[PDB]
Design a protein around this motif. Structure first.
Motif: not given
Length: 10
Positions: A3-6
């Protein structure tokens, strides 16, 4: 997979 950026997660 990763998850890079939720949104509102720190």
């Amino acid at each position: 997979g990763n998850h890079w950026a939720v949104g509102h997660l720190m």
